[PDB]
Design a protein around this ligand. Structure first.
Ligand SMILES: *[C@@H]1O[C@H](CO)[C@@H](O[C@@H]2O[C@H](CO)[C@@H](O[C@@H]3O[C@H](CO[C@H]4O[C@H](CO)[C@@H](O)[C@H](O[C@H]5O[C@H](CO)[C@@H](O)[C@H](O)[C@@H]5O)[C@@H]4O)[C@@H](O)[C@H](O[C@H]4O[C@H](CO)[C@@H](O)[C@H](O)[C@@H]4O[C@H]4O[C@H](CO)[C@@H](O)[C@H](O)[C@@H]4O)[C@@H]3O)[C@H](O)[C@H]2NC(C)=O)[C@H](O)[C@H]1NC(C)=O
Ligand SMILES: *[C@@H]1O[C@H](CO)[C@@H](O[C@@H]2O[C@H](CO)[C@@H](O[C@@H]3O[C@H](CO[C@H]4O[C@H](CO)[C@@H](O)[C@H](O)[C@@H]4O)[C@@H](O)[C@H](O)[C@@H]3O)[C@H](O)[C@H]2NC(C)=O)[C@H](O)[C@H]1NC(C)=O
Ligand SMILES: *[C@@H]1O[C@H](CO)[C@@H](O)[C@H](O)[C@H]1NC(C)=O
Ligand SMILES: *[C@@H]1O[C@H](CO)[C@@H](O)[C@H](O)[C@H]1NC(C)=O
Ligand SMILES: *[C@@H]1O[C@H](CO)[C@@H](O)[C@H](O)[C@H]1NC(C)=O
Ligand SMILES: *[C@@H]1O[C@H](CO)[C@@H](O)[C@H](O)[C@H]1NC(C)=O
Ligand SMILES: *[C@@H]1O[C@H](CO)[C@@H](O)[C@H](O)[C@H]1NC(C)=O
Ligand SMILES: *[C@@H]1O[C@H](CO)[C@@H](O)[C@H](O)[C@H]1NC(C)=O
Ligand SMILES: *[C@@H]1O[C@H](CO)[C@@H](O)[C@H](O)[C@H]1NC(C)=O
Ligand SMILES: [Cu+2]
Ligand SMILES: [Cu+2]
Lengths: 334, 334
């Protein structure tokens, strides 16, 4: 079940945090491809980027006309700038557990701030990694260190990267956000109600739902049908209690492929005809559409970043079967 | 007898206690405290505790000093602000996010305020036994489900808590710090030049050392003999690569007790005659002085918060045998 690089075809698998994962470097940045187009049947790409502080932008401002980009900060911190059409340009400094949503046709760029920064990208549809094989240089990285210590515009268009050379990232950031009057780590964040608009959710400040059918699970939606539209997927974090003795761990099966990366805790996953395996920080589990699976938290509290192809995968299912909830913690009693 | 315990033992012995175990939980208003290492369990060497709490618009504790205990604040997740002042020196304050550290020596006035919804503070207090104060002021908590937190003057001198009613937490915070002429997440941080002064180290910005004897390990000191003086302990984070197949995992036996809490990764500990046991996020291992033990990272990269009684524990040993290093990542080649 465990693999060192994402398979070159669809199958159940788990890839440990910092596994080789076809690693490439672009300057100081090291990219790992935990889920690829070939490994997901082109459903989505799930990549991890580790990098040190930089005084320069990490990528030139650009747009994707056919890909929805999602930025999740695993650790450290990076600034993200985003703008849809003539809407006011927005920017936030994401720290651990923060999220930034970048729908198609939204200009964006980012800059790495902290020394031990890790950015997990979820891009829909999959196959997006080809861009980095081109821009990057293969890295053997024998020791598995997070990152190594120390015409083109036309070409990029074929990778669905359209340069926005006139975009000037705003420079009036204060307390991790701009413009003024925005809410960042000081109040609730809502997902954009209008398709096409970027939005940001600070860790623990977005909408949540408690599902109590199989133990306590809290789903914090990041992307729903409203925002995905035809890109057809869902994204969220799922926090989990242990499974009480009175509950039978359920067996799931969905039409679309799905995957999750453990952020905190220890989660056991059983997929298809493979032995159960326990995942820790940054480990990724990939479940092909149509394959049965079971999971439970061995830790008293675990939190995972979850993505699903389709409108009704696991996270949406738990939300529908649960209730609105206003805490990152579940009830103290069963 | 078993290695893993749900509450710290009432005497010195090797043990592991999982994140969010009962650990003699108590609540003080919205804050839930867990005592992973106590005075009794460590022979009064030190206390290692965890506090989980939601956002609050008020201070989490009234300003105070401890005349006989050295307090240490480490942000596991979320964020909280910490204010500190020593004698005639300028009052300092920082907003700590994941991986950040704040040092509060004896006789330093301090207070804190919880900012994010899913905030966890790991406290290391030396010497051990101060936790009686939390038992005293707190209300016992059963917390059957092990949820992180429950959703929703003269007298204290005996517990070494001295009120400082004249202290007014400064309110000119900008970009997570005050006064303006400080460095926070924008440059290198040094440990205080002498004992008695508070200091703060942002994640990855403090001094680091690379030890290459047993695979690669990076030690980021937080407290050294210079700052500890007679409190006689060391504190740091230790980052670890896997152990090369050609390297024998070393065995250690120190004069004083030591412990660590995994922050990221998967670390296996083999203590005395107990079974090798793998720890995940927030899990704590405690090793009595004089007891042999081995540890190694199963994850490709793990980072733990480490504390040791004495001046020459594991972290100091790794520093003395290693070299100065300027990256949070280790070399790509053995
Ligand atoms: C809290 O934290 C936030 C960060 O989260 C801090 O925000 C930072 O604040 C500083 C200072 O305000 C910002 O830097 C300044 O940015 C100015 C605008 O830059 C853009 O426009 C210029 C003009 O066309 C371009 O050249 C720039 O391009 C370069 O930078 C971008 C990055 O944004 C790169 O992508 C490019 O490749 C380029 O490298 C930008 O597009 C900029 O004009 C200004 O530069 C002056 O000042 C610096 C030193 O501060 C000098 O080195 C430089 O020579 C300039 O000096 C002239 O102008 C100043 C101002 O009028 C005069 O005083 C001088 O005498 C001289 O005439 C500087 O770079 C920064 O962008 C911003 N960061 C973010 C993310 O928002 C907050 O300050 C902080 N708050 C507190 C209180 O601490
Ligand atoms: C960036 O984020 C900062 C937080 O990290 C923001 O700082 C906050 O700024 C507000 C507004 O200036 C402060 O609130 C005000 O505080 C003053 C002073 O409070 C103290 O003194 C009064 C009077 O003696 C006393 O009653 C209080 O108890 C305090 O002891 C009040 O007079 C105002 O009414 C108001 O409450 C916050 O205190 C301050 N927070 C911190 C932690 O510093 C900053 O404003 C943000 N900057 C921007 C541009 O958005
Ligand atoms: C994105 O922009 C292109 C160019 O205008 C347009 O043809 C396409 O329909 C847009 N796609 C979406 C999802 O808005
Ligand atoms: C680099 O790795 C990619 C796989 O991501 C592969 O397609 C290519 O052949 C490799 N190129 C070189 C020069 O090794
Ligand atoms: C959305 O994805 C699901 C699962 O991959 C698939 O069954 C469904 O046909 C898709 N919807 C559309 C309109 O393509
Ligand atoms: C702390 O302050 C008390 C009271 O002033 C003093 O007696 C004691 O020696 C001080 N301790 C340290 C370590 O500075
Ligand atoms: C601090 O200043 C006071 C006077 O306000 C003085 O009495 C005291 O000795 C000073 N502290 C030190 C350590 O010098
Ligand atoms: C505290 O302990 C008492 C005695 O065991 C128990 O009755 C009570 O329910 C406990 N309080 C809480 C909040 O758990
Ligand atoms: C410091 O701690 C070590 C380890 O517990 C102990 O052996 C030593 O005696 C202590 N030093 C002093 C001065 O007490
Ligand atoms: Cu992009
Ligand atoms: Cu204190």
């Amino acid at each position: 079940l465990i693999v060192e690089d994402a398979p070159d075809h669809v199958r159940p698998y788990v890839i440990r945090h910092y596994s080789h994962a076809r690693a490439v470097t672009v300057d100081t940045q090291l990219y790992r491809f935990y889920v690829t187009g070939p490994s997901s049947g082109y459903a989505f790409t799930l990549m991890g980027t580790n990098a040190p502080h930089s005084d320069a932008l990490g990528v030139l401002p650009h747009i994707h006309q056919k890909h929805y980009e999602n930025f999740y900060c695993n650790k450290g911190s990076f600034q993200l700038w985003a703008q849809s059409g003539n809407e006011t340009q927005q920017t936030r400094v994401l720290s651990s557990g923060d999220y930034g949503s970048v729908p198609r046709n939204v200009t964006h760029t980012f800059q790495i701030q902290d020394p031990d920064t890790e950015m997990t990208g979820v891009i829909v549809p999959g196959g997006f990694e080809d861009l980095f094989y081109y821009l990057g240089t293969n890295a053997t990285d024998t020791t598995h260190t997070p990152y190594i210590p120390s015409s083109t515009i036309s070409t990029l268009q074929s990778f669905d990267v359209y340069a926005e050379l006139s975009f000037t990232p705003r420079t009036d950031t204060v307390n991790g956000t701009a413009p003024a009057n925005t809410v960042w780590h000081t109040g609730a964040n809502a997902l954009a109600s209008t398709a096409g608009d970027p939005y940001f959710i600070a860790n623990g400040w977005g909408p949540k739902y408690l599902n109590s059918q199989y133990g306590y699970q809290i789903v914090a939606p990041f992307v729903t049908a409203t925002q995905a539209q035809d890109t057809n997927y869902t994204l969220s974090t799922i926090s989990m209690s242990t499974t009480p003795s009175t509950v039978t761990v359920p067996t799931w099966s969905f039409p679309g492929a799905c995957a999750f990366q453990v952020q905190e805790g220890r989660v056991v996953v059983q997929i298809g005809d493979y032995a159960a395996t326990e995942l820790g920080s940054g480990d990724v589990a990939f479940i092909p559409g149509g394959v049965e699976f079971k999971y439970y938290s061995e830790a008293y509290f675990s939190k995972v970043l979850f993505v699903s192809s389709g409108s009704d995968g696991l996270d949406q299912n738990l939300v529908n079967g649960g209730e609105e909830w206003s805490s990152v913690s579940f009830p103290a009693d069963w």
